[PDB]
Amino acid sequence: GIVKPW
Amino acid sequence: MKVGQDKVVTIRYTLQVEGEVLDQGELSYLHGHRNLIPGLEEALEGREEGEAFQAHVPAEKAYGATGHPPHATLDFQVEVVKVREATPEELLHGHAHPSGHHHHHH
Ligand SMILES: [Ca+2]
Ligand SMILES: [Ca+2]
Ligand SMILES: [Ca+2]
Ligand SMILES: [Ca+2]
Ligand SMILES: [Cl-]
Ligand code: NI
């Protein structure tokens, strides 16, 4: 999840 | 509806770094709450639902020197699939929720 981090 | 603060935005995307597809897919996010890569959100600002565009995000508007590669330019191909206003619950949680109702907290 690099675009929308956790 | 245009992408802007407190909109829940659904995007289809392909992410390339140095010409290699790293990740692609579809996701929804709450705009204006630092929930995306900063440079990407800036590129999405004001886009109309249905718009397709490319965005170059320099490492400084993303992962900088650490990366997650160092000093990489992120190459996004983006489709704005859906734009809607957030629910009160999404605004108070500060994130987008799945369409199905399910009251909860964190
Ligand atoms: Ca390609
Ligand atoms: Ca946030
Ligand atoms: Ca276009
Ligand atoms: Ca619509
Ligand atoms: Cl979100
Ligand atoms: Ni929640």
Q: How many domains does chain B have?
A: 1
DSSP annotation of B59: G
Contact B7, B86 (CB under 8 A): yes
What domain range is B4 assigned to? 1-106
List, edge to edge, every strand of the sheet that includes B74-85: B20-30, B7-17, B74-85, B52-57
How many angstroms separate the CA atoms of B81 and B28, rounded?
Answer: 9
Q: Residue B72 Cα, ligand 5 centroid: separation in angstroms?
A: 24
Give the residue from B14, B26, B33, B37 with the most A CB atoms within 10 Å of its CB, the best one to mutate: B37
* CATH, residue B42: 3.10.50.40
In the structure encoding, which two tokens stand for residue B65, read together?
A: 């020197």
DSSP annotation of B87: P
Burial group, residue A3, by CB count within 10 angstroms (0-12, 13-18, 19+) = buried
